[PDB]
Every structure is written in C-alpha cells, then in structure tokens.
Write a protein that binds this DNA or RNA. Structure first.
Length: 56
DNA sequence: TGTCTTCAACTGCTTTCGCATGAAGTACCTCCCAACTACTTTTCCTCACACTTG
C-alpha cells in the first residue's frame, strides 16, 4: 500500500518543496569507507564499492 | 641599591579499540527476625455442702 504512495502530491505549503525519503538497504551501488584501526596513515582508511555477498 | 646563579619542589604526560562483567568496600549500630521453651488464654465441663426431715 505504501509503495503506491511513495509518489503522492504535495499536501502542505510547508512541505511542498520536499519529496518523501526511503531508507533503502545498502546495495551494490553504494560506496563505503573501510578503516582498519592502525589508521597510522590515510591510506589505511579507503572507500570500497559495496558488493553484498550471499551466505557470508 | 641593583642584578645575577644554582637547586629543589611542583606540573603534566608517555598506544588504540574492543570483549567481559561486573563485583565490592564497613565501622557503628541495629531492629527485625527466627527460635526454644515455658507460660498463659478462652470456652467448656463436671461435681459438691448445708440445713433441714422424721
């Protein structure tokens, strides 16, 4: 029922400029910042492209 | 009147990030509590003596 309401029209002039938000799960198109303690250097905390692996 | 020098006392830090799993102080005091035994408590039960009789 909510899937057919994600695109509803404006309702209040207070909110007419916004659009709804969806808290989507992390997926294969997001980048994530991996850090390993040692931080000793900036190269020890890089951004990797997320690949969800099954049964991990 | 003025400026200088050493020593000892005082200040602040000296790996990061998480699991465990939190527990334990205690003197002085006690009033409450649990105890053993005896004592006490409430209802009930049943008999008994004297004067008089003949």
């Amino acid at each position: 029922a909510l899937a057919n309401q994600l695109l509803t029209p404006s309702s209040n002039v207070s909110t007419h400029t916004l659009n709804k938000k969806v808290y989507r799960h992390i997926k294969n198109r997001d980048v994530v910042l991996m850090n390993r303690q040692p931080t000793l250097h900036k190269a020890s905390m890089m951004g990797h492209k997320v690949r969800v692996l099954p049964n991990e």
